[PDB]
Amino acid sequence: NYQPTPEDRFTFGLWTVGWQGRDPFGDATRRALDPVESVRRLAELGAHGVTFHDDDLIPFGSSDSEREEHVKRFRQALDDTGMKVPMATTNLFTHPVFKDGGFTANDRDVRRYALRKTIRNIDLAVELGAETYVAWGGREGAESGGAKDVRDALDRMKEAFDLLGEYVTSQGYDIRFAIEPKPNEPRGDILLPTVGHALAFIERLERPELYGVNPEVGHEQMAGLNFPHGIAQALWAGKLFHIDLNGQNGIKYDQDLRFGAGDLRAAFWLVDLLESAGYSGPRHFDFKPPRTEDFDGVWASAAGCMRNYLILKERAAAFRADPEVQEALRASRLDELARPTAADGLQALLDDRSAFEEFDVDAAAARGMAFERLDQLAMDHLLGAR
Amino acid sequence: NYQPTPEDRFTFGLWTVGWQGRDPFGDATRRALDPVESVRRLAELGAHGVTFHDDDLIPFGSSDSEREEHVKRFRQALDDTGMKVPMATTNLFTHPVFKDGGFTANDRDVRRYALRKTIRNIDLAVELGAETYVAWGGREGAESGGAKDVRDALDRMKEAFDLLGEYVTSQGYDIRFAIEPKPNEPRGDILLPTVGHALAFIERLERPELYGVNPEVGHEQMAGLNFPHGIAQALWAGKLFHIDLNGQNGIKYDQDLRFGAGDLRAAFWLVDLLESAGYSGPRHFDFKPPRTEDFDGVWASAAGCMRNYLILKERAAAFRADPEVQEALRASRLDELARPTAADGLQALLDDRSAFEEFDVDAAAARGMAFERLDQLAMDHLLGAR
Amino acid sequence: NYQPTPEDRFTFGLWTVGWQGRDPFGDATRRALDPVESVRRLAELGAHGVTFHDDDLIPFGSSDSEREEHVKRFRQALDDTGMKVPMATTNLFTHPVFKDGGFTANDRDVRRYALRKTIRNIDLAVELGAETYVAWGGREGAESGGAKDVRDALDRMKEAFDLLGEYVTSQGYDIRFAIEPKPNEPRGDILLPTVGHALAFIERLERPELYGVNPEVGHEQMAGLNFPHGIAQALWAGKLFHIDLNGQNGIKYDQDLRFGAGDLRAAFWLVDLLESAGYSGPRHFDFKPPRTEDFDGVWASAAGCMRNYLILKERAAAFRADPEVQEALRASRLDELARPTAADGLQALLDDRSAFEEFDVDAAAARGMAFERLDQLAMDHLLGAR
Amino acid sequence: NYQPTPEDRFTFGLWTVGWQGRDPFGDATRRALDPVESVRRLAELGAHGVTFHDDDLIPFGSSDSEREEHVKRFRQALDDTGMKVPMATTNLFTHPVFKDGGFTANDRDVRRYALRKTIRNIDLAVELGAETYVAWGGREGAESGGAKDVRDALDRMKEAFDLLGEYVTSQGYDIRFAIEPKPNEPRGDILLPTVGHALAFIERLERPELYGVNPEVGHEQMAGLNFPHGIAQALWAGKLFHIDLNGQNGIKYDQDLRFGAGDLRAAFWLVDLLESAGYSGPRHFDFKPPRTEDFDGVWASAAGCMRNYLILKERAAAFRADPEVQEALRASRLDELARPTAADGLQALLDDRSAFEEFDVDAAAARGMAFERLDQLAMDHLLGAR
């Protein structure tokens, strides 16, 4: 009954189940978790692996020998459980030095520090076997218009990512980068606020093949955008390197609800797309168990992430396999959308009088699209009524 | 006192002052304007030129000889007034045949018709001297998840724009294309919903140098995004071919208020950026005089568009020239944001102990950014209090 | 299998299935329906009744004898089908005379006309057996700040509703009024924009017992509000006289999708509340079949409204009856929320040292709320996984 | 030049300039301020007074003698500076015990504790001379649908406020209560989410005359609502007891920018209304100096709050006094909006054939409202261009 196993490739950040529940208006409601205990607990739930910021694993300001002890204990728990580390990232947002950003801070010495802190963790990520290195520029942005010249900031952002690409190529590392967009919070506006802006920026880097996106359900929904549409564009560009799964109820602060909560039908269409397109990367949950919960609620919330993915996968597969849905998809001309508009070429199109001079525009206009019947078949499948 | 002249390059769509006031809940409140009368009236107000959809100028279904008469009358009014036509576009959204889109309609024969209708108007636009051809795919999208496979739709969208680029290159035309994003309305979600998504899509076309964006103030604000930030990214990419200026009060239906209405401080920062970056294209107003107004209100609203641009241009120039603002910009390290992070290169950065091992993180963190004083100088300048 | 019958009390506006598909950017895609054919078709689908604006049933400007013929034909179709008319309303938004409002138009003569048009239709509604008369003030509002003094406008709004209440009391009619809030569209901001503002306004009318609310799913969601929470407050006040059911995908133009579309989990919690609280009024669908559809799609969309209500009713009933959910509700202390805080009274509370001086705040804080496990049981029930 | 003095009645919360800059993603960037130093600094800037939560002034868990020392030091600074304390409030949101609310927590013992903590601070507020006691129920709400039966929660909310009203009446205190709405954050949805919902709830309390609202600019804008419209409704009801002034850029997390930032034109229309209606309460700033700033930026931001109010007051007064604006207001029939619709009464309206049978609907419809010219005069005045 919807039991996950490590072959489902479900992963969690240490910072997710480890969130102590401090929000802008309240103190922590839960004690800190030891990273080793989170690995063991997630393994028992059926997770495939974990992800980390540098500062989740090694407390900021650790000596080189404290650092080695923290890594050794962690590696022992991975060895004991079979858990993998497919992704890692840098914390360039918590410490006060990053209050105006890391890569695009106005102060040049902070930008250099940010790059050195990042490079140190790329080495550790490669050592632990990560294939993707995520960058979330949560402090790159502004609350006011004159504080940040955005063209200069984009020059600095490109400079930073180009240097990171020079570093991993010169070291011979097999790792790729994924940029995680967010439109706002904690800055009033954040640079590269959506999947689209991030994809566009990547095409201006010196080695674009090293960079993709790590979209997050809730972040695109904080701009009111359709998250499965944005994922489709990332897959179309060949840039979906990683994904953050969670839930969000509309345009408000980043809630990071468990996956399946928030916009349930968008979750269904997302799973349909990921499974249809054959996405093979980790199914990563970036979520926060609500601060109302104790530790039993933390693990129930994490289990629910995986459960909802597996229920929606079953319902989406049943939808696509249903002969009546296949009939309805042809009724709505999804087959024709997949055929070229003008494989005969430009000149043939220009000479084709059935495309304009003799085209019966009123008869084409009268054809219903039959989209509502198709969508109710999708609803029946989602609700198990079919 | 803030009087426009044609050298300010203010342009208006025929459909703007010509909007009859029909909305989803009400009939028209104004009679139709003759395009010739709109040209003459806008010229008297100080406009530089006008723009048009094919169907604004030539009623849909006109014979080839009615077409010639409509164009001749129009050309005579341009000759009489000195007005230019810098941009033109196609109506692929009003007629019922386009109810599921033009370039990405599921029906293949509609897609071919859409391309033929577009090509016919590119010829006319070149004849009238337009330098930019805008595409707004207002019907390209969906209300439900199964109606539109977005990867196939993006294939069809790329196919259409590639064919248009083959057409203008084979004809030897000096015209470029600009894609106008909008996130929603009239479709539940529209493909290429923001500036970012459009910029990313352009980089996958066969001849990307022919395509840029035509962002609209209100459209990016319907997703809660920072419009001057998005314009900066378009300028950074070298893709700001055209712009639509108007006003919008937040996340709701597309209001198309006169420019300066809506988010006034965003309008100030937009003008600052366009003038600082030396944008030389048309300052185009895509706005709707509210349906409360009679024809005297139409021309007052149009005049207000230009007036507000010129007031904000004056205030932004005073801001940037003020020695006290120049001092504050250095106080906030805007000068340092413009300097390379690591012109010394990767290896020097790695060997620079002042970038990490000896970096005094607490002393850097203690430095205030002085952004609030800078922003209050900007407010004082905007309000004329300085 | 989820078949509606008239005892389920599903009703539809004539303007819903009759929407021709004209939106702000496009012409109609469907021909007009005769009201008689809509009654017959809805009866065959299992509807209980229909609702109407005056102008849906009697074309604007009809002679008194054309009026009588339109009503007679309509009454014959009701007699032939068994369909009821539980609600009626006035169109104070389509005609250009209402461009600045009806009850709160700045022009006094328009306000008087609006009241006379309303009163004429109250007589007809009573004749057809309606129990509720809805007012939706879609044009009452403003696009700019100086156009409307809102205190004077609220005086005029109160004046109008007080006169309508004087009219129905002096006539001896058994009808009540329901105010339908909407935050915006077609005006930039609409007066009484949410359920809350409407409830507050009612308490200042001379005969508040005659007035309640008619909330609409999509309208509260256009302000990002929780629609089941708002309905609970209306039920708490005893003011839920009628309800408009449909779907909406977040903060954007009013989509009026079929019920169950949009925010599916909010639809589940709404049905749970209406059924638990014993709401006995009509389940009215104010929805628009998308303009992509032909007439077969219109009736499929209408059928889907009813189907989704009945599926969600079944799932909500299964949730509330499940012993494991009953256990979880006590685990989360829903039983304690229903018990008085201080039935012992103020003085006893003040003297109760276990409420403050001896209250163990850390032990209370440590108690998990168990809300995530409860919510996953609700998800399992919704998806039929339980 | 726009210098505040204590007669302008500008007040600040201790928690505003005292915000250390901890947000959901980052540590504090500023040290804690001593309340005594904040009083002295605000007095030098021209403030009239300060406000406080119980826990801002007396650290949580203080002994009764530490409590007395904290109050004495505070009272000495008030005596030294002339500063007043017009409002006070309770912190029912920071401590983990309040994670599911105070007055509407599911656990009954937490609800009793919340009432005792509140009552203790009402006594102190009266001792310091406060006239208004604010309640902001920031934790009253839910992230999921089954966690909170909202009708039971409203019963508990009414119970709590009724007991507080019994307490202040039995003690003979001259203090009134003001409910501060917020739609979301830190709970997914908060009960009483807007001004309207709060006004409606007050009318169901046992002694409604003791309760009003304390609306906040940014909170109504987090629901996309028009804040001057909501204030007008509160003034119309006679319930504007207090106000929180700040700025917000649209629908996102609560930014609490300095007043004048965010939606500048809404700030202009708010000041116009408050000054026109003769609001005599405190002009209270609930704002957060951005965490980019050091302490010099804190005081610059606070000074800017007051400066922007005084600039906007001048511009609004110039607007209303301008004979050309007075002419335009009559042109737009604002004078007619203030006149009764039907002072002649219902029967006269029914007998008035010029209100319906002989009303020339097309001639009324043709009249322009002249709202755009009026709004451009308002823009010219705001920008000092007039």
Ligand SMILES: OC[C@H]1O[C@H](O)[C@H](O)[C@@H](O)[C@@H]1O
């Ligand atoms: O970059 C990894 C993570 O960093 C921070 O935790 C962000 O809040 C989250 O969105 C992101 O995914």
Ligand SMILES: OC[C@H]1O[C@H](O)[C@H](O)[C@@H](O)[C@@H]1O
């Ligand atoms: O494409 C030109 C114009 O077409 C339509 O009028 C759109 O509503 C507008 O946004 C666009 O700019």
Ligand SMILES: OC[C@H]1O[C@H](O)[C@H](O)[C@@H](O)[C@@H]1O
């Ligand atoms: O008042 C009845 C109906 O009137 C209009 O059709 C509105 O768009 C709808 O929201 C409302 O319910």
Ligand SMILES: OC[C@H]1O[C@H](O)[C@H](O)[C@@H](O)[C@@H]1O
């Ligand atoms: O209740 C007083 C204050 O409490 C908290 O600080 C809130 O964040 C603020 O909105 C409110 O005004």
Ligand SMILES: [Mg+2]
């Ligand atoms: Mg996130």
Ligand SMILES: [Mg+2]
């Ligand atoms: Mg998030």
Ligand SMILES: [Mg+2]
């Ligand atoms: Mg994330």
Ligand SMILES: [Mg+2]
């Ligand atoms: Mg537009």
Ligand SMILES: [Mg+2]
């Ligand atoms: Mg627009």
Ligand SMILES: [Mg+2]
């Ligand atoms: Mg446009």
Ligand SMILES: [Mg+2]
């Ligand atoms: Mg509606």
Ligand SMILES: [Mg+2]
């Ligand atoms: Mg609606």
Ligand SMILES: [Mg+2]
């Ligand atoms: Mg409705």
Ligand SMILES: [Mg+2]
């Ligand atoms: Mg606040």
Ligand SMILES: [Mg+2]
């Ligand atoms: Mg706030």
Ligand SMILES: [Mg+2]
């Ligand atoms: Mg506040």
